[PDB]
């Protein structure tokens, strides 16, 4: 079963140590119940610890939400290859916990297209770079978050 895909942009401003993530949209999200009510959480992490959290508004009853919602984080130059930006799409439930639809992260210890997006940001400072990412199962991303390069 596919969980969906998420589009976001990354921008790093080295002089000011400012990291901006814009959640653009998601597509083909998993239908969670017998349609999902997606919102997106961002966690900035450094070695298991949460430095900052942000989240988008909620788009009710859609597998294909459009957000274009921007979030900024303070990350000094010397720390930018030590953090992870963790992006989770969740299903808002009025009565009960909000279950995760899928998850992805970018940062130096990411891989494949996640690493490429992060590296393209760092190679092209001050410019937002947009890219799509395949959402993965929360527990599998959590496992990989713990593998250092
Ligand atoms: Pb729901």
Curated annotation (Swiss-Prot):
Q: Where does Ca(2+) 5 bind?
A: 33, 91, 93, 99
| Post-translational modification, as annotated | Glycosylated.
Q: What tissues has this protein been observed in?
A: Expressed in the brain and adrenal medulla (at protein level).
Residues recorded with modification Phosphoserine: 70, 72
Residues binding Ca(2+) 4 are 33, 37, 91, 93
Where the record annotates domain C2, the positions are 2-133
From the Swiss-Prot or TrEMBL record, state where the protein is found: Cytoplasmic vesicle, Secretory vesicle membrane; Cytoplasmic vesicle, Secretory vesicle, Synaptic vesicle membrane; Cytoplasmic vesicle, Secretory vesicle, Chromaffin granule membrane; Cytoplasm
On subunit structure and binding partners, the annotation says: Homotetramer. Heterodimer; heterodimerizes with SYT2 in presence of calcium. Interacts with SCAMP5. Interacts with STON2. Forms a complex with SV2B, syntaxin 1 and SNAP25. Interacts with SV2A, SV2B and SV2C. Interacts with RIMS1. Interacts with PRRT2. Interacts with DNAJC5 in a phosphorylation-dependent manner. Interacts (via N-terminus) with RAB3A. Interacts with SYT12. Interacts with calmodulin. Interacts with DNM1 (via C-terminal proline-rich domain (PRD)); this interaction facilitates vesicle fission during clathrin-mediated endocytosis (CME).
Q: Any idea what job this protein has?
A: Calcium sensor that participates in triggering neurotransmitter release at the synapse. May have a regulatory role in the membrane interactions during trafficking of synaptic vesicles at the active zone of the synapse. It binds acidic phospholipids with a specificity that requires the presence of both an acidic head group and a diacyl backbone. A Ca(2+)-dependent interaction between synaptotagmin and putative receptors for activated protein kinase C has also been reported. It can bind to at least three additional proteins in a Ca(2+)-independent manner; these are neurexins, syntaxin and AP2.
Entry text on domains: The first C2 domain mediates Ca(2+)-dependent phospholipid binding.
| Family designation | Belongs to the synaptotagmin family.
Record-given protein name: Synaptotagmin-1
Encoding gene (name): Syt1
Entire protein: shown range: 271 to 421 of 421
